[PDB]
């Protein structure tokens, strides 16, 4: 198994995947923090404070009250500042031909700020030939959804081999998975897993943990995702840094 | 088999599916405009000109370049003129909790004026769950995704199985399904069918059609989704028109 640092070289490493596994590598951290708010500000303030902490800071621009193209400029800035990716965590899920305009235009422009948007593989591969027609001439990266964290998730078996296999035939654009494991064995391609907390538990909507040390150590996954586990609690900063510590030592034990 | 103006009365119909039945039935229209438009003034004079015509205008609410909420409200007073529904093409495809702020919340306050909105299910029934929890209170209906119209489409089978038993266990909130065909027995449930043109072909991004023909007459279900096929005409009325009457006759000769 080789390092982050190692990985960020491979021969078939997409270029903001290997970005991404040197900030890692620098600053000890396989955290991305869920920034699930709706006040501009909070999403500032968090990204500032949280921003040594975390090697990705992920986005959902339709839940931002006040979004303007100008807050994503101030988060760009954070994130040049801090090193860390900013993630558009939009599921793209349609035909080709609308999610190409979904990427690029209407209010958000996605593709101007996020250095990783997500798809759904459920549509077929028209769906990541529609986004990499936008995706590629701005030198993004984008993530196919293999498994999903939630009661009654139906991407399992062959809807997740399908996901793997369309990442693999796509390796100019697509920079690797959400997923609640490792799923492919070649390791130029990113595993981030949602769903995590450090205690059992769940929401109420669906949801369930389970924690750094599980998805990192045993399930073999680089990066793990965290919202709540960070937003509600008070320190905010305290939060980040647990759960950072957590999934740097078990990815640190699983190198061995 | 019941007409439309039949099921709009039937016992377990939902409030929304038994209006939009209705001016299905008055207005000799089972057509959905897809309004794949860029400019507010365009899907404004397509909604005026094509309101007498559809039985419903279908939003990519996040292409629009020039969207805010009184857009929305020139909209709304066209749907009202002309009697069609409007439905919001999201596709929400995350955990519940996400997506009820997705639903109600940010720049766009879908629930605020989308009539319709649909769902994939991949993320199991949470997402249902979670988007009910801000329609229901806002008198609003749901469409399932059970089957989709484009190459590599994993919508089949037991995924279709699985879309069909979820819609028909929140009927409370969920309406019908986007589908190629009939999937639900319940004539309670609306099946609307995009990929659809008078022309055999498809696109460039695994878009695939069928004719109205086809989908409503062989293939049993009750709503065209047409985009292209009117919107790139020179003479959208008259496209319209023949999209219309293709798929309303289907619709009488399947009665007989
Ligand atoms: O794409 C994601 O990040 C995602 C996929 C998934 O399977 N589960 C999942 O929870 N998410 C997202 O990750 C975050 C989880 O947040 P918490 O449950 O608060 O930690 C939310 O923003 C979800 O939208
Ligand atoms: O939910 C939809 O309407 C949808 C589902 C599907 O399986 N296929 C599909 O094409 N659509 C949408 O319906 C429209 C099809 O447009 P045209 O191919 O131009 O007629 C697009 O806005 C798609 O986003």
């Given at each position: 198994?080789l ?37 501009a500000?909070?999403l ?9 902490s975390?090697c ?8 931002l ?41 209407g ?10 948007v997500?798809?759904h593989?459920?549509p077929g ?37 399908a996901?793997?296999?369309m ?6 654009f ?5 997923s ?18 450090l ?31 960070i ?19 078990a990815?640190?034990?699983?190198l061995?």
């Amino acid at each position: 198994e080789l390092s982050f640092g190692a990985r960020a070289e491979l021969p078939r490493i997409h270029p903001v995947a290997s970005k991404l596994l040197r900030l890692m590598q620098k600053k000890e951290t396989n955290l991305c923090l869920s920034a699930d708010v709706s006040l501009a500000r909070e999403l500032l303030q968090l990204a500032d404070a949280l921003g040594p902490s975390i090697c990705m800071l992920k986005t959902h621009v339709d839940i931002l009250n006040d979004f303007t193209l100008d807050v994503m400029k101030e988060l760009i800035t954070l994130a040049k500042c801090h090193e860390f990716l900013i993630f558009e965590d939009r599921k793209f899920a349609d035909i080709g031909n609308t999610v190409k305009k979904q990427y690029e235009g209407g209010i958000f422009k996605i593709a101007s700020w996020a250095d990783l948007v997500n798809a759904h593989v459920v549509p077929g591969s028209g769906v990541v030939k529609g986004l990499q027609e936008v995706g590629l001439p701005l030198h993004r990266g984008c993530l196919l959804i293999a498994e999903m964290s939630s009661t009654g998730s139906l991407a399992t078996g062959d809807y997740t081999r399908a996901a793997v296999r369309m990442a693999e035939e796509h390796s100019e654009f697509v920079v690797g998975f959400i997923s609640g494991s490792r799923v492919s064995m070649k390791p130029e391609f990113l595993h981030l897993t949602p769903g995590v907390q450090l205690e059992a538990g769940g929401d109420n909507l669906g949801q369930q943990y389970n924690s750094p040390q599980e998805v990192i150590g045993k399930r073999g996954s680089d990066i793990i995702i965290v919202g709540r586990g960070i937003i509600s609690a008070a320190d905010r900063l305290e939060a980040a840094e647990m759960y950072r510590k957590a999934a740097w030592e078990a990815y640190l034990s699983r190198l061995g």
